[PDB]
UniProtKB/Swiss-Prot annotation:
The modification N-acetylmethionine is found at residue 1. The chain holds residues 1 to 30 of 61 of the full protein. A divalent metal cation 2 binds at residues 7, 13, 15, 26. Belongs to the metallothionein superfamily. Type 1 family. Class I metallothioneins contain 2 metal-binding domains: four divalent ions are chelated within cluster A of the alpha domain and are coordinated via cysteinyl thiolate bridges to 11 cysteine ligands. Cluster B, the corresponding region within the beta domain, can ligate three divalent ions to 9 cysteines. This is Metallothionein-2.
Length: 30
């Protein structure tokens, strides 16, 4: 797992539009 970003790898993260990840890099919300 990652520190700042805590998005899974299943793809159920569906972050963005309300992401609180500090260092998120899910391609889109990167
Ligand atoms: Cd994240
Ligand atoms: Cd994500
Ligand atoms: Cd994100």
């Amino acid at each position: 797992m990652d520190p700042n970003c805590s998005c899974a790898t299943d793809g159920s993260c569906s972050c963005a539009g309300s992401c609180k990840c500090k260092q998120c890099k899910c391609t889109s919300c990167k």
